[PDB]
Design a protein around this motif. Structure first.
Motif, PDB file in Angstrom:
ATOM      1  N   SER A   1      -2.938  31.947 -33.855  1.00 25.49           N
ATOM      2  CA  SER A   1      -2.783  30.619 -33.275  1.00 25.49           C
ATOM      3  C   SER A   1      -2.156  30.688 -31.886  1.00 25.49           C
ATOM      4  N   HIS A   2      -0.962  31.283 -31.779  1.00 27.35           N
ATOM      5  CA  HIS A   2      -0.294  31.378 -30.482  1.00 27.35           C
ATOM      6  C   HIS A   2      -1.206  32.011 -29.443  1.00 27.35           C
ATOM      7  N   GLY A   3      -1.803  33.146 -29.774  1.00 26.01           N
ATOM      8  CA  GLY A   3      -2.874  33.694 -28.971  1.00 26.01           C
ATOM      9  C   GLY A   3      -4.191  33.317 -29.606  1.00 26.01           C
ATOM     10  N   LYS A   4      -4.934  32.411 -28.971  1.00 24.15           N
ATOM     11  CA  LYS A   4      -6.045  31.721 -29.625  1.00 24.15           C
ATOM     12  C   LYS A   4      -7.193  32.699 -29.861  1.00 24.15           C
ATOM     13  N   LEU A   5      -6.944  33.665 -30.748  1.00 18.48           N
ATOM     14  CA  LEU A   5      -7.951  34.661 -31.116  1.00 18.48           C
ATOM     15  C   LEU A   5      -8.807  34.047 -32.222  1.00 18.48           C
ATOM     16  N   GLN A   6      -9.605  33.059 -31.833  1.00 17.27           N
ATOM     17  CA  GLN A   6     -10.470  32.399 -32.796  1.00 17.27           C
ATOM     18  C   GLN A   6     -11.861  33.009 -32.742  1.00 17.27           C
ATOM     19  N   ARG A   7     -12.420  33.081 -31.529  1.00 14.87           N
ATOM     20  CA  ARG A   7     -13.813  33.418 -31.254  1.00 14.87           C
ATOM     21  C   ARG A   7     -14.731  32.300 -31.724  1.00 14.87           C
ATOM     22  N   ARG A   8     -14.171  31.336 -32.450  1.00 13.33           N
ATOM     23  CA  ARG A   8     -14.925  30.256 -33.065  1.00 13.33           C
ATOM     24  C   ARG A   8     -14.131  28.968 -32.856  1.00 13.33           C
ATOM     25  N   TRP A   9     -14.395  28.293 -31.736  1.00 11.92           N
ATOM     26  CA  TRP A   9     -13.610  27.114 -31.379  1.00 11.92           C
ATOM     27  C   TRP A   9     -14.228  25.841 -31.944  1.00 11.92           C
ATOM     28  N   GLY A  10     -15.539  25.861 -32.207  1.00 18.28           N
ATOM     29  CA  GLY A  10     -16.189  24.661 -32.714  1.00 18.28           C
ATOM     30  C   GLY A  10     -15.655  24.240 -34.069  1.00 18.28           C
ATOM     31  N   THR A  11     -15.967  25.027 -35.116  1.00 17.83           N
ATOM     32  CA  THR A  11     -15.434  24.949 -36.480  1.00 17.83           C
ATOM     33  C   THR A  11     -15.040  23.535 -36.901  1.00 17.83           C
TER      34      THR A  11
END
Ligand SMILES: [Mg+2]
Lengths: 178, 165
Positions: A154-164
């Motif tokens: 979360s803090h580092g937005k390591l999502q790769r998937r922002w839509g979700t």
RNA sequence: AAUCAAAGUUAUUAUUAAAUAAUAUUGAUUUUGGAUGAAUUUAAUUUUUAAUUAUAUUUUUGAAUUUUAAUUUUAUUAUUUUGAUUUAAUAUUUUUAAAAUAUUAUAUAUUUUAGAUUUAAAUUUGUUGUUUUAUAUUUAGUUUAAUGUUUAUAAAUUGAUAAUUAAUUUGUUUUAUUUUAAAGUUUUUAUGAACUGUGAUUUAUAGUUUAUUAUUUUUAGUUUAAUGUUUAAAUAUUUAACUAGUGAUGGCACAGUUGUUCUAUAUGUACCUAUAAAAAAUAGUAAAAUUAUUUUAAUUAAAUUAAUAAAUAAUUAUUAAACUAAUUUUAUAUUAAUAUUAUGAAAAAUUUAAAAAUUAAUUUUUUUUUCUAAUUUUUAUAUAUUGAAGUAAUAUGUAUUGAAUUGAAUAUUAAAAAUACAAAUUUAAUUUGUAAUUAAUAAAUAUAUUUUAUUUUAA
RNA sequence: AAUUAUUAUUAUAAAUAUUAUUUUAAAAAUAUAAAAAUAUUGUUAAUAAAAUUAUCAAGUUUCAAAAGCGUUUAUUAAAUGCGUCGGUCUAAGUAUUAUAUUUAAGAUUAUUCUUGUAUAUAGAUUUUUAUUUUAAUUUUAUUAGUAGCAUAGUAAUUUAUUAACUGAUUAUUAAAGCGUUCCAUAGAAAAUUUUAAAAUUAUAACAAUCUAAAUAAAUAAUAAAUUAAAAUAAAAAUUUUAAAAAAAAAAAAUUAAAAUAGGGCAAGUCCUACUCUCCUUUACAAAGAGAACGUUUAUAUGUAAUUGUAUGUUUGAUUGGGGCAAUACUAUAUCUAUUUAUAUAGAAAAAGAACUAUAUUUAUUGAAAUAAUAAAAGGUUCGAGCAGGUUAACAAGCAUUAAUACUAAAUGUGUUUCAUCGUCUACUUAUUGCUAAAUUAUAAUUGAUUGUUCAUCAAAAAAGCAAUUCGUUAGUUGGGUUAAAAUCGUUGUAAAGCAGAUUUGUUUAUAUAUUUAAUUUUUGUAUAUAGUUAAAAAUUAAUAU
């Protein structure tokens, strides 16, 4: 073929687990018997302490006695007071006063002949609890080793998937299963 | 060997005990032509105000009124169909008989009680067995025809010999 | 060793299609004949390249149907001169073509491992996921009108004449539609005798046995066998057999309800069911399909009949209904109108039947919002103490009968007695000798209880 | 011929061109066979017609059955063909001829008797048998006869074989051969005898040619897989699931190793056939035209006629309306009887009435396998049934389902069965299956097994015999009659180039005897005589880190 609603199971037929057992009648199916129940059955009760009270400490289904007869060890420390609401205010010795006590019992446990190389190890872990509360249980370890990774994503937005958008987060959050 | 047809349903087309119009078949009986021979005896012979159809042995009432089955006192196998014409005469008693027995004030020895009729007759006519069992000598069954001309006996009936009670 | 979940952009090029429109039309894609014509001929009183505003009649009773609409009056066979108009459709090619996460002795993708599993559709005629279809991607892929606003008005009856105190609506006239894919067929005429039939067609390019011009036969293309089995072949390789044709692979000739047939229902151009062509034949009567999530009232039925299931009940369904004593101050899906290609009911309880199941039977006949709570648990009690084996001559008697013999223990016969020991072992018979109607209490539960899979809440 | 493919396109002519497309270091199968002692059919349904050869590539003989030599889409007592014979024809072809047929030549003979077609016929039908057609049911005489001969059968006898479901002989009442019969009979298919090269059993025995890799890049099939194994129960089924509980290359056990045949049922259509159904129909007869011939009618209806029916239900009989059998009724079990046959045309004209239909009642004959078919499901060979083997236990005509025939070959397996302890026989006839029976002595019983291999059987108009059919045809019998794909998963055998070393525990294709001798104790026991063993024989050795 007589295709009439109400002539059988309405649309085809399905075998959900509430059917493969508990069929029509509760026995219930001829095939698809059922899965074996691989839960964790609770263990049977320990033996109660010897009587030496003459108060009929033996009686099981009596009004006075709660079922459990657990007069274990520093239970006298758990000296309870009667509140106003009908509750109870149990004054017990804090989690430090016990581990610090446990050290005393244990440090004089193995010292008689020779404290083993593991006996020196335990008193350290014990003396490590009073000082730092170096926790040893899975429920936190299982939680902390994960909760950190989950919050650092979360803090580092390591999502790769922002839509979700809760449709794509629909499968996920239920493909996981706790 | 052969085939067979299905046995039709020959049963009541009203509820016994309840009121009845004449265009209702009270019971559609088996004209028991054993197998389409010409001799049968219907189960429910006709009763008061009930008239039997000759062909199909079906009882049609003749006047609108409450209906009932009178099982013969002698043999409980032989029944009549009574239609008593007055519907108020029984309704305005049932509504009492069933209002009294609710307050526990009705007696169960009523004639209309199903299980009492065996004893009811015997309280009043104590030798009724002997009144139907008695065999009549052929003399008294054909009372002196001169008593008919002299007018003593109102009218000789020589064939009515059987006590249907 | 083992896994590891994984890349949505080519780049670049410009005036067809379809319906429609009521003006032309002797057969579109070289220059007939080229001797001089005879050779470049398609015509006849029939739904025809002619295409017709009604529901009443009448009718093999049941697929048969309405007559000028204004008499040459306009419903009539159609384009260049708005890239000809309009509305629907839209591309097709050239060359583009991509990518970095989960173990370390193994069930299946979630990072925190464990929990977890019909792949679907149909088919299930509950022989109840019954042996059927699907490699994948994208494109294309199936027609019953969910509505009634002022001119304006309907409504029955006899068999028939007629009768119509007979009682009453609605409607500026509402029609048209009716699934999708799929046969073998079936009829209507056009093409084909280069394959192959049969007709006809060649009058002497090798070997040989026998007196013989007849006749044995060299015999490398052909009655067999192996290989091949989407094969080099929708018939080939190797091989067996056969082979003597002045009477025949062959000039052209016969054509489809028919030719040909040394006849096998064989072939007539690589399945003769000829090809080719033109239809919408039938296929709901167990073929394959029939396209749009998050919903908002339930159920089965089982009888009349069938040169054996399109039809009827009953069920279900769509739409709509009115509150008749019975009770609590309970509780109640009852109906009408239409739509309807159905004959057979788990476990029981029994009942027919060699059933070895079928049949009757009659109650079942499952669609989980999410977090949570819970009272039904692959844990129940199993028959022994004691090979009682010492303790004594006898005596009606070896009864009688039947018996070769029999003496309690051959055969049958069995209520005799007295001083207790006749249902045996033993012996060819007996005696001896085994045997002498006894202590041997499993019953006294063992855990009962607690404790676990469905009786609630909150959102 | 889909191609630059199997492939001399053989109309001709000619004869010495040093004319010019074929990868490569292995053993499995397999195509295939050089080489090589014995044995000679014991293999098999059955050896013998089975490539070439310089070692020069050829079995002989007897018997029984069997015609012509041509000709055929499942290749032959198929159909041809000469003669004889029957019928027809003297105004289109020669009446010792040519049409139209049945047979079959050659050699013997060719029997008894007729109910129908045909002929003749006389208004026609109805009648009616010189010859012909078809027939003969006890025709059945000649003749052969267990035979392609309906079962009965392996016929009973004889041979033959060690063993005779072979085959041949005798006779002889053959389920119903039969005069077109029978004999004669050659190369064919059998049965012997016998010889013999194909690698026939025994028996296994690589010389040859058919790499990997590098390159080009197709096909069937494909719902998925991380499960797949394995064991056990199941429940409708073969088992597959469910569940429990475990834990690279060859081969074809499973998945669909198969194709496609094999069933039987349903609705649909097809095609063929005849005393009973029906048109278009060209023939026969009548009439009409001074009958100059063509047309039109009437009456007739022909399988020459190509239309449609030929069922339904339970299995082969039944079809109706009642009743008794718990006011259940599959047809269950029994019986009864004016229990009635609705409509439409005709028939009865007032109110009254007749006829007939699977008696709910729609259609206008009955039969076939036609290689029947097309669209579907569903079985013969089975988790359960039925009738004919010493009476009774057993072959096995209906509830599943690409399991797609019995047997053989090869190759396994889990069982179970007395005292060690136990299960290896090979043959003959027939390939049916299982016995009979020969080898001194003779194969335990169950179960799952065969897509790998054959096809012998069973088998799809190619026929034929007897047999049933009015026919089309049907059922026994014999000769004929493609039987097949690149192995992906599991599975298993091997392997992964490794190793100074077998092995702790897993787990085991691997196990000393079942074709009997000679010793030796033949004494113990009793009328004959045992028992440990040994030699020989059946001749072969077996370790993944
Ligand atoms: Mg689309």
């Amino acid at each position: 073929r007589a295709q009439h609603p109400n002539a059988g199971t309405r649309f085809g037929r399905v075998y959900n687990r509430g059917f493969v057992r508990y069929g029509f009648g509760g026995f219930g199916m001829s095939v698809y018997s059922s899965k074996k129940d691989r839960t964790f059955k609770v263990m049977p009760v320990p033996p109660p302490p010897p009587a030496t009270t003459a108060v009929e400490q033996r009686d099981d289904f009596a009004d006075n006695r709660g079922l459990s007869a657990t007069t274990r060890t520093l239970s006298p420390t758990f000296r309870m007071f009667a509140l106003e609401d009908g509750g109870v205010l149990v004054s017990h010795p804090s989690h430090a006063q016990i581990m610090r006590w446990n050290q005393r019992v244990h440090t004089e446990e193995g010292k008689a002949a020779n404290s083993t190389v593991m006996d020196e190890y335990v008193n350290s872990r014990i003396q490590a609890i009073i000082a730092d509360n170096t926790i040893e249980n899975t429920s936190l370890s299982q939680w902390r080793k994960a909760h950190m990774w989950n919050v650092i994503k979360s803090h580092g937005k390591l999502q790769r998937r922002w839509g979700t958008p809760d449709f794509v987060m629909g499968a996920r959050s239920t493909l996981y299963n706790n | 060997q052969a085939g067979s047809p299905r046995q039709k349903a020959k049963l009541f087309h009203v509820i016994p005990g309840t009121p009845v119009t004449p265009v209702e078949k009270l019971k559609e009986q088996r004209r028991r032509f054993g197998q389409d021979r010409y001799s049968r005896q219907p189960e429910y012979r006709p009763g008061r105000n009930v008239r039997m159809d000759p062909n199909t042995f079906t009882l049609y009432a003749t006047t609108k009124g409450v209906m009932t089955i009178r099982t013969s006192r002698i043999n409980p196998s032989y029944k009549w169909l009574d239609v008593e014409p007055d519907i108020q005469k029984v309704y305005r008693s049932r509504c009492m008989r069933a209002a009294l027995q609710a307050r526990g004030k009705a007696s169960m020895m009523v004639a209309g009680n199903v299980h009492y009729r065996a004893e009811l007759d015997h309280v009043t006519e104590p030798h009724w067995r002997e009144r139907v069992m008695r065999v009549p000598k052929a003399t008294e069954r054909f009372q002196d025809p001169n008593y008919f001309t002299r007018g003593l006996v109102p009218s000789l009936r020589p064939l009515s010999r059987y006590s249907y009670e």
